[model samples]
Target: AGEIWISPQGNDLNDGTRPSPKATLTSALRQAREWRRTDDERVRGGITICMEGGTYALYEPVFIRPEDSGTEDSPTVIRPVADEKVVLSGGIRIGGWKKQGKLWVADVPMFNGRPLDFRQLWVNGKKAVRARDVEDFEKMNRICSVDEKNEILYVPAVAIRRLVDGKGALKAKYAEMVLHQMWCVANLRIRSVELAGDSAAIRFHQPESRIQFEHPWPRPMVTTDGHNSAFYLTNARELLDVAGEWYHDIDARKVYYYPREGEKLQDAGTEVIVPAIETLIQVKGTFDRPVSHIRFEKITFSHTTWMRPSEKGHVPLQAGMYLTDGYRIDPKMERDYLNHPLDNQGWLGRPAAAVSVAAANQIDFERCRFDHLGSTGLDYEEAVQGGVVRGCLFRDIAGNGLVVGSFSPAAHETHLPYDPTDLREVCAHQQISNCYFTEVGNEDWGCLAILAGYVKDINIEHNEICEVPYSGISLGWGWTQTVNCMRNNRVHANLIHHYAKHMYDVAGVYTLGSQPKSYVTENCVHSIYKPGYVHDPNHWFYLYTDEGSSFITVRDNWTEGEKYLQNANGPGNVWENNGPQVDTVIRERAGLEAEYRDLK
Candidate 1:
């Protein structure tokens, strides 16, 4: 049919008309695919699945496959029914709350006869704290040294005592130690914390312990900022000390929370939500049969969970890509690069997103909201072409706001340039503009607001990005000077500020590898945050071209200062008019053009 209506109160067996709406989006989409395949007279032009205002609990991602494709003139559209603000929720509400003194407790629901174990919890549209210690950011704990061979780290005995609160020796169950390394952060699962008088030896679990000790660039250590390591502990029952904190005891199947001021447990509108899935929509297709001509508008994607860090711990190489397996090349191997030896390399894994698209063409996402996710907002994973993401709002996300294209293959060495034989494996002809991104990378701390890797003909412009812990717009991957699948990428008219909030060696606009014919121009960048725990206080910049950045032109960008770094770059790169003197008109014109000014 040309049009189908969906409502939360409707039945799945309905006729799918305006008066008789379908109950689920899955049902509506299946009907539309049938009409397109049969070429029905009712679907002579196009199809639209209009959703009425209500929360649609998509426990699993509503998948759109190759068979769901529509012609250009008959594109399939999924949108709210006249700006009704529908929510595609991956979270389930937890009820039966009972107050015990100042804390509220409830039994977590079981799935497949087993208690559910999740990390993220949301209360009344806001994320709840997971019972962490070292509440004061300025007074963080430190590590003394690392025992690399034995896979143990030494820390002050006071740190261990504070976690256990003088209750003698205790077992380390779900507690994780989050470390602030130079350019990234690592989450290490605590396996054991053995106290030895004034010093303590901390040990981690299998994969993270092996990866963290093996990696050299951001390894655990003590350095110039005198007790150079800064860390905090989270997800343990002993750390539940104050309001707005919560803890989950998986063995006892109990969910506990200490509410903030004015949060009454008996209130009729009080809500507690725990995420059950990691994604809301997965528009997946193969290279041979790509899904095309699909658009989503004015809908809110929210409340998805990512459990990778809780499962294996996260130690990333760079830009939120985790190191699945890595180690320092013993005795150092020299590559095509000039001066230094290639010391470390890692095979990376991508983070999960609330909405992921792949092997698709002509995909458009406009004026939508991606919020309250445990990982990235939206991802064009790979093998995608010709898409536009415009006027969308991405906020309160744990990882990158948006990620496009492949960084490197699993078996490929990370430092080598990647020019895959199948050009369709590359993401090309994608435009991401007029999008407002804020409060992203809130949990991971090393993720970017926007990251595009090995892409061609990508234009990321007119976006306002802020409140990040690392880089803002990161383009290109595989730190090599040789030519690859990256070319003709553009970064223009973006406003990036208040970044580097947690780590150093970052920039507003950063690049890696050689992206020929690329340009970075007319962007407004300022307000670099100098955190108290940074190893090098002077390691931040407004624009940085790191590693093998080559053949790119950086011109006329209105940075607040002339703070930039070009470290070990290759030839054919041009930098002109890229400082404070760029022009007042350019600064005012960057980020969110007049039509989307309300996003700021």
Candidate 2:
């Protein structure tokens, strides 16, 4: 029943009472820690830290450890004062701009001698495009040929000539390729470029990591032949002509921006923010002592960025994460459940999230807004239990909305009958309810709105998920019935629509592997159609039970459009009362009309 106040205008040395508050949350948390150590009943029965309105720009993450936990009777709460807007930002405002030949130049140096290679920029709260080779996505540039001996990829000279004015040396200076593979994409650097008649032999900084196409398409490096593969070159100054496009020069340590039409960069209220921090807050505790009984309410977290891997080439296996041993497993079946590269080898290449929770329990994020993030919104990773995320809005995110649990390597590496000891670390009893996830998965087309893997007793209900490029929700992992770690998970009463806009092999509510007592019901899903690209699997509810997925029930779900159901070789999965598809009829379902549905 004690309280501490934090205001941006207050001093850290203040007593943190109502009139005299602390300046930062760090100072208030220190006082709370000191109060918890003393045997005072007034302070022992939970402390509430009230934050006044203002922005808190953090250069590093705020760590919440086991010492910050509170008892069940008295939960620790950090909330904004009523109607006050509290923003936790991981970005720096860029000012002092000067015009340079139709582009705005900023000599903003890195903070605290820290090197900055920002991957995202925001102009007036809108995400601006980075300089890219292809202006439009429909017309992808093709690879002409590949030369393994010289480590060069040949492309049409006209494309390079248009960018560099036919100067081969200029083409070599700032060339970087963002090539799309079957399920993964890579971003590689260019070393040099040589023109031979009508084509340019572009030499890479290193050898091409892997061929664009696998065995089905002709392997260029192996067969000594040319093939048309999808790729987009970027980072050259010539590609920065489009409005709202920006380019960052690593050598010059300068940023160039092309202002939009009728817009001035030097206007009175115009501002650009470059995201520098990858994570804003992390709740971490050891396995023995978990951070528990903490809650966040009525706050906004924004402006975090995720930089693509530059040291090594990123070849993702599934969901933009790398898998080293994916070559040994079946590419068609067990690709997505392969081992994470970090588990075996060290950091290959993986994106991070804004709020990461590991070994934490009884944590709730309520009435919060996660917007304008350059990567995933929140991650509930290993051993996180009794977590609730409700009444939040996840908007304009680059990656997935919330990733619960990670793929287990042992479950995929071992054969049938998975070892129980290996699959013991479970994230369970999580609930995500009454949240709005929209305009998310913007950068990663294969991303999902809610991705849960290797979790048990999870409940996803009453959420409105829309406008995503890929699936709405994905649960279970291992792709085998023998690895039955994820069980009793339920997805119900959700409104999932407007998906499958970009990538293939998507669904409204997708499930993998075996969950004996799981079900998906009372969800309204529609507008799930593939726009017909190369080899798109246009299924709405894909039961990818390849290895051994079984014993689930799907009922009373409303769906529209083509290929509403697809079962990829599994068993004991019953489908009943599903709608308007190849085998079912449409009907009004339950969980739609409640007077207090939006009360929260």
Candidate 3:
């Protein structure tokens, strides 16, 4: 085969020359192969395939077989010579690659089709693209062409638009999925180049190698393009207590994640199987090592997908940037890799939380932002200790921004014994410090839902949590884990406000348990919403120290809401270091009834 360079301008094989005639990449490979297998021995037995990247129109498919191989030093290098961009008119189809199969590729711009109106769209440079307006979404699924719409939108709106057309009939049924930056192929380096293919912009499959995975988590990021989730990994084992962090929205980018589906539904426009973009990042890792050590600093994902009432004429398969179907026919790897969506995360909501762990001794997500998504942002299942989330923000989500709990035995078919000692060792040591939470829509009840079902040694400090429809923070655990085992959890030094619907459980720091003990100290909670100040008076906090819970404390805090402290059970609590707002609001709302009423 001959070493070849491509361009319409012809030149010597060894020297720089533009391809005399724009040739297909297929021709270059064929010629290069012929040059390598020639009878001429001893000569440099390799080939260089250089591409003067430009718009390429492939009428048919170009297949690269498995027989292809790269040498140790100059392993079949395919690159775009400087300053050139490659665009494929028909789009690249990845149909023949097999398990443990690979193809070395580099320097190529993908099919970023005609950029339409994307103002209402939110792109999570790190995750999936999100759409804000009806027209934005309509264009996404080709429901309405750009010509059909007239209004233009603005940015910093945390939205995203599609770049390429969909795959055939099934393709148009779905919304257009845009591309992100990088991908971790087994042995390939997919460096800088804009890419958005038929489905996944970039996909990494297991390379044909004889090696076992040796990490708590599947993939790790060496560097980031402001959006960490731009790289998504399927967790082999649900990680325990992956501490939360703040990520900046590089722009208005709203990162989106698509969880696993039970079946492959055909309609691209079908909403039934196409998950909402806000699903949590489903991770997989080894149980013995489970996700422990990692960092997500200075990242942002906004304009996440949410479950809105299906609009009239909204198609089912709206094509969005979708994940590659990485599951295996063997079912073993499928069971081993693909994660269960949040709706099935019951095991994660318990004491032996499916995602709980004592893995990484130190982890941090510093100065980041979490804008919006199709679902929630962070779910701290089981226990996470020896970590910190400082200076982070959680804006909008379908559910709470963060949820805390121990492994729940009832959530899964398997039941690991409840180990309180180990649970406390892992949970008690983590911290959520110096963070802000605003415009955090509590559509899922409570912006921060802390189900202390056998959880321990925890603290929520130096933070601002507000704008929640339900309780700002819901505490205590019962139905699943016993209380006598729960201990040492605290929420201190924070600002919490704007709560509504008492039964929906709104609060600054809500504590409810039968036998467990927790604390709330040194915080400001006010400007809460209450429809009725009489029987329906908005309480500053709900401290339900049932006969089971003991030694709970509430001190050193400022509150300006209903002071109807209710704890008419066996366990007594504290009210020390409490500021004047507590006494005044209690007096004003209860008409001195709160001061005279006592659990004793």
Candidate 4:
């Protein structure tokens, strides 16, 4: 066994200093590395590294190998012992760069067999229609705004030409199919410094085992703010778990301003610059003996800013934490066998977003704050299973407080295809519990509590939430099915409020998928700002099922409230509870903002 110690006795990154300090992170890790490499693993005793601190800033991710692992009972512990904090720093240096050019929010024209738009076709069906064929194409072009493009996702026209014309966009196939509007960033490791005031803060990569990752897998642990990730994994055993804490400050320039027409913007981004200490460690291994086990017991996060959109919006805690599922391509790869593999080979056995989980038993978030993100506070995705988010606060996110799940099953499901012979395998399941979600922002973009994907067995109970675009807790979809077709998964006991955002009410709940059986009840739902007809008389709970929907419930809930009297809007929301069939109320609520309705 070995031991690495830090006590103002280390080098620079961890040495603890300012603008340019000494005794750095390298010093502390150096000690740890020395011990890790020479330690005797068979001795039953593992390494015990301690950081006796002072504010130390880190520039790179700290990685610990499996050869450095200890026994289950005696995990090789690497923790801060006292005196100070460890901060992680670095981000996109904000400045006038051509890369920041605005993205085209409009549709591109299809001229001369060339896709004028980001996507070559409208993707509806049949043939690739020319721009002249669609009446609305021109209208879409007008409303499209633009902004600066991100340097990371850029493919110079020259490169594109050499790869396509010299090669072939598809036929010659010189370069990889242009990755649409996505980027690949993986093997990311960070610790002890703030992702700071001007940064995306949260991001992840789709796991890729070969060319990029010489290591076999990703760790069970991730940075405190992990979302907007764009990597893929190649190990069935890889795990994703985030421990430690993330703190954020407010910034006005980052969130507003939709991009202009014909411009390509950065799809998503991560932390840029700041002063913080991160302990987002990545470990490798399998769930059977999971790569890592992370637990957070006392983490504090705060986002305090005041931004009011128009006269009805209130934005507090402007800079919040973020978590995201991997991104999907604009033009999906309908038949890429590498999308999902049955075993750990072509595509890692794990899903594209195989979230990290602690070793075996449990994962949890206690007393954490997710506040003030222009669009979102907390987000989760791809194979995130078994966890608890308790006593966490979410506010001022453009979208929702804490949202989980994925796109349609048709789009999210493993591309195993319907083999007439194999039927033993299917999808995966996940759970959520005891988290408080709020919406304190410019009511312009509506917020939500949980937006699901092909989710199953999700337990959402005993939480208080407010402000939303629609659906405090929305399940199912007109798009796909719950990942697993099981029973007794519960969604109850939430204090939900519906406020007006853009044109949406606060409390709307939808259970939308093909064969869904869920339990929703014992909650309080009311609308605060009523902008449209649907908000005029908002409903408590709305349930729905179509010819393609079934087996769900909405029982015993208290639905009582009216619109803010001072506001000139109405309250005419609908509630269709206790059903096994399509609830028009749910259908209406799901599309409230799209067609201006009252809050229920």
Q: Which residues of candidate 3, in runs, are more than 4 Å off?
A: 1-284, 303-359, 412-426, 446-453, 479-483, 501-505, 514-517, 531-547, 567-572, 577-600
Q: Per-candidate TM vs. native?
A: 0.97, 0.86, 0.42, 0.43
Candidate 1, superposed: residue stretches over 4 Å from native: 165-168, 224-227, 337-340
Off by over 4 Å in 2: 144-154, 162-174, 194-229, 261-263, 324-350, 409-424, 529-534, 537-547, 562-568, 581-600
What TM-score should be assigned to candidate 1?
A: 0.97
Best by TM-score: 1
List CA RMSD, all candidates.
1.5, 4.8, 22.4, 19.0
Q: Sort by lDDT, best first: what order?
A: 1, 2, 3, 4
lDDT values for all models: 0.88, 0.70, 0.36, 0.33
Model 4: per-residue Cα lDDT over 1-600, one tens digit each? 344555444445542322222354345445444554665352246444454543333333344333434444544554454524432221111212123222111222222343211101111111111111112211111001111121122222322222122232222111111010111112221111112223212111222112122221121212233211122211110111111111111121221112223222343231112212112232333334433223333332222111112111121110111112222233444323222211211121111111123232233454444433333344443334455666555553434555554433333333222221211111124445555565543322323566553456677766665665445665543222222343344567565666333233223455544334566666555554443222223432332222123455556555543211111111122233433233434322321122212112
lDDT of 1 by residue, 38-115 (tens): 888767677999999999997668999998998788889899897598999988888888988888999999754556
lDDT accuracy of residue 374 in candidate 3: 38
Worst 10 residues of 3 by lDDT: 312-321
Collision pairs in model 2: 481-548
Q: Give me the displacement of residue 234 in model 3, in angstroms.
A: 32
Per-residue lDDT of 499 in model 2:
76
TM-score of candidate 2 on Cα atoms, chains taken together = 0.86
